[PDB]
Structures are given as structure tokens and as C-alpha cells.
Design a protein around this ligand. Structure first.
Ligand SMILES: *[C@@H]1O[C@@H](C)[C@@H](O)[C@@H](O[C@@H]2O[C@H](CO)[C@@H](O)[C@H](O)[C@H]2O)[C@@H]1O
Ligand SMILES: *[C@@H]1O[C@H](CO)[C@@H](O)[C@H](O)[C@H]1NC(C)=O
Ligand SMILES: *[C@@H]1O[C@H](CO)[C@@H](O)[C@H](O)[C@H]1NC(C)=O
Ligand SMILES: *[C@H]1O[C@H](CO)[C@@H](O)[C@H](O)[C@@H]1O
Ligand SMILES: *[C@H]1O[C@H](CO)[C@@H](O)[C@H](O)[C@@H]1O
Ligand SMILES: Nc1ccc(C(=O)O)cc1
Ligand SMILES: [Cl-]
Lengths: 284, 44
């Protein structure tokens, strides 16, 4: 009944577990009653269409740390109750067909970090209304297109750090009304649209450190009425009068922020924007 | 005659187990500093 490379047990949930067994393919004969399937740490290179189709009650599927080079668009057909899908640490994946997650209406945790992803294609996260945690860090993303997350009204954690994102457009984060933590550090972000955070009134943690920011428009942080933790260090901040709105916002912020180190002008290059006097930012 | 607690700090680490702290100044029974657990992310 159980595949030779696996251990199968019924409690607490029906589980087929075969991690780190040197598998090059999804094993045949996984029990249709499986509720959890653990295939992490193998060398699986392809997930064909309907690889788990008979497992109608599946809620946990772990495929991380494999050698995935292709996931069929219909790989997850049948998995209408799937709640957790870990595809992370498959550095040669590179692309996920934008229909791959369609129909996963109970999905609440989706791991896609360390997958070599070059882009988030149109519709990739369509209709994932139950999604809570979305891990996209440590890929090769070079853009955050408008409306990429627009249906993710229940998302609370969005990790995007460790990519090559050069800017945040107006509607990148449209729809993210429940978002709690937004991790955007270690990117190439050179500007944030003034209204990029309009829907993030419930955000509590924002990381923007290790980017390419020299300034933030006056409006950017205004919508962040619940913010408690803010990291802005390791950016080339200019501390002249163009920094006055950020300075003023930081003076009134009731949470905790990182140092905001001045890069220029040289006479202030040894200072934290937060600690400057108002007279240092006069002029415009 | 305690003053209000400061906001909790940034997390000591953003990978794995870390802590935040907060402080308050007198004017008086109770602590002066507290810490609490934080975990932002798992890092390989
Ligand atoms: C805070 O956010 C995390 C999600 C990571 O991106 C952290 O970076 C990692 O920090 C550890 C030390 O805690 C370093 O050893 C890793 O090299 C670094 O990627 C970040 O500080
Ligand atoms: C799914 O669970 C239901 C309810 O326990 C059960 O009747 C059904 O046989 C299960 N489906 C599979 C494919 O095992
Ligand atoms: C969205 O989140 C709320 C609160 O957790 C929940 O009641 C609702 O069912 C969720 N929507 C889904 C799962 O589609
Ligand atoms: C700090 O702690 C609590 C609020 O967290 C209260 O006892 C009071 O605000 C104190 O200053
Ligand atoms: C720290 O703890 C929570 C947020 O993590 C709040 O009670 C408040 O922000 C406090 O300073
Ligand atoms: N890694 C895991 C292995 C097994 C189980 C379980 O049987 O609950 C959970 C996690
Ligand atoms: Cl933090």
C-alpha cells in the first residue's frame, strides 16, 4: 500500500513521508487518502500534470529542496483543500506558469523562496483569497508589477527581500488590506511611489534597508497608521532639505525605527537623520 | 511614579530567535527594562 521509499501512517493525519531518499520523481502509488505528503530533500526534477490528483483531501505538500526545473501548469489539479505548499529551495525552477495555483482556494501558506524566479507573471496569485504567508525572498525578481497581489486580502506576511526590485509602483501592493509584515530589504529599490502603501493601513513591520533610496516622498509613509517597526538603514540617504518630510515623520513616529544614516552632504555623513536638528533640513 | 514604557525595540536578529526590549524611567515598584521574544524569519 505504501511506496517502498516512504513511511505511511494514519495519525494524526494520513501521511506519506519520503524525505531525502534520493528520489528523482514523485513516487508512484502514494495512497489516495494522504492528507500530508513530505517529499522534501529529494532530487525531483519535474512535477507533471495531476501528480497528486487522487489525493483529494491533501492539505500539506512539501516539495522543497529538490531539483525542480519544471512544474506543469496542472501539477496541483485535484488539491482543492491544499493549505500549505512548500516549493522553496529549487534554485533552477526559474519560472512558475501563471495558472499553476489557480483553484487552490484554501491555500494559506506558499513558499517560493530560493527558486531562481525571474518574474511574477500576470495572474500568478489570482483568486488566492485565503493566502496568509507568501515567501518570495532570495529569487531574481526585477520588477513588482501593479496588482500582483490584488486578490490577497488575507495576506499577513509578504517576504520579498534578496531580489533585484528597482522600484515600488503605485499599485504593487494594492489589495493587501491585512498585511502585517512587508520585507523589502536587500533589493535595488530606488524609489517608492507616493501612494504605494495606500492599502497598508494595518502594516506593523516594514523593512526597506539595504536598498538604493536617497529620499522618500512626503506621502509614502503617511498611510502606515499601525506601523510599529521600521528599518531604513543601509541606504544612500541625502540629508538636505529634501529629507525634511521624512525627518518630520520620524520625529512623530511612536514605534521603533532603525538609524537612518546620512550619506551626503559630507558634513553630515557621520549622522542619523532622526537625530538631526530641524535647522539642518531647512531650505525647501 | 513610573513613566510610560518605551515602544518595543526592533528585533535583535531578523533570522531565528531574537528579542526586543523596552525601558521606562522612574518619576516606584516594578522593573525598569523588559525583553520579549521575536522571530522574524527562518534563514538557511
Ligand atoms: C533580517 O531579515 C532576515 C529575513 C534576513 O534577510 C536577515 O539577513 C541575514 O542575517 C543573518 C544574521 O542574522 C546573516 O547571517 C545573513 O547573512 C543575512 O542574510 C536580515 O538581517
Ligand atoms: C477524503 O475524506 C473523506 C472524509 O473522511 C473520505 O470519505 C474520502 O474517502 C477521502 N478521500 C480520499 C481520496 O481518500
Ligand atoms: C480571510 O480571513 C478571515 C479571518 O482570518 C477568515 O474569517 C476568512 O475565512 C478568510 N477568507 C478565506 C479563507 O477565503
Ligand atoms: C507599559 O506597559 C503597559 C503597556 O504595555 C502599561 O502597564 C503601561 O503603559 C506601561 O507604561
Ligand atoms: C510592543 O509590543 C506590541 C507590538 O509588538 C505592542 O503592545 C506595542 O507596540 C509594544 O511597544
Ligand atoms: N517534519 C515532520 C514530520 C512528521 C510530522 C508529523 O507526523 O506530525 C510533522 C513534521
Ligand atoms: Cl523588527
Amino acid at each position: 500500500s505504501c511506496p517502498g521509499a516512504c513511511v505511511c501512517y494514519n495519525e494524526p493525519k494520513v501521511t506519506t513521508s519520503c524525505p531525502q531518499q534520493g528520489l528523482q520523481a514523485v513516487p508512484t502509488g502514494i495512497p489516495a487518502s494522504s492528507q500530508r505528503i513530505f517529499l522534501h530533500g529529494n532530487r525531483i526534477s519535474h512535477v507533471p500534470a495531476a501528480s497528486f490528483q487522487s489525493c483529494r483531501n491533501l492539505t500539506i505538500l512539501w516539495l522543497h529542496s529538490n531539483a525542480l526545473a519544471r512544474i506543469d501548469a496542472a501539477a496541483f489539479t485535484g488539491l482543492t483543500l491544499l493549505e500549505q505548499l512548500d516549493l522553496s529551495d529549487n534554485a533552477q525552477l526559474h519560472v512558475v506558469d501563471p495558472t499553476t495555483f489557480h483553484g487552490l482556494g484554501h491555500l494559506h501558506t506558499l513558499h517560493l523562496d530560493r527558486c531562481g524566479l525571474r518574474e511574477l507573471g500576470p495572474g500568478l496569485f489570482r483568486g488566492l483569497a485565503a493566502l496568509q504567508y507568501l515567501y518570495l525572498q532570495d529569487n531574481n525578481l526585477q520588477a513588482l508589477p501593479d496588482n500582483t497581489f490584488r486578490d490577497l486580502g488575507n495576506l499577513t506576511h509578504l517576504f520579498l527581500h534578496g531580489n533585484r526590485i528597482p522600484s515600488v509602483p503605485e499599485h504593487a501592493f494594492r489589495g493587501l488590506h491585512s498585511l502585517d509584515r512587508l520585507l523589502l530589504h536587500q533589493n535595488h529599490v530606488a524609489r517608492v511611489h507616493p501612494h504605494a502603501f495606500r492599502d497598508l493601513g494595518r502594516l506593523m513591520t516594514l523593512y526597506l534597508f539595504a536598498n538604493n533610496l536617497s529620499m522618500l516622498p512626503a506621502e509614502v509613509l503617511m498611510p502606515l497608521r499601525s506601523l510599529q517597526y521600521l528599518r531604513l538603514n543601509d541606504n544612500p540617504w541625502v540629508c538636505d532639505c529634501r529629507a525634511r518630510p521624512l525627518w518630520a515623520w520620524l520625529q512623530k513616529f511612536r514605534g521603533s525605527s532603525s538609524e537612518v544614516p546620512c550619506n551626503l552632504p559630507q558634513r553630515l555623513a557621520d549622522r542619523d537623520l532622526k537625530r538631526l536638528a530641524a535647522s539642518d533640513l531647512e531650505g525647501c | 511614579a513610573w513613566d510610560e514604557w518605551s515602544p518595543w525595540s526592533l528585533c535583535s536578529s531578523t533570522c531565528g530567535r531574537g528579542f526586543r526590549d523596552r525601558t521606562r524611567t522612574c518619576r516606584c515598584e516594578g522593573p525598569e527594562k523588559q525583553t520579549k521574544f521575536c522571530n522574524i524569519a527562518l534563514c538557511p
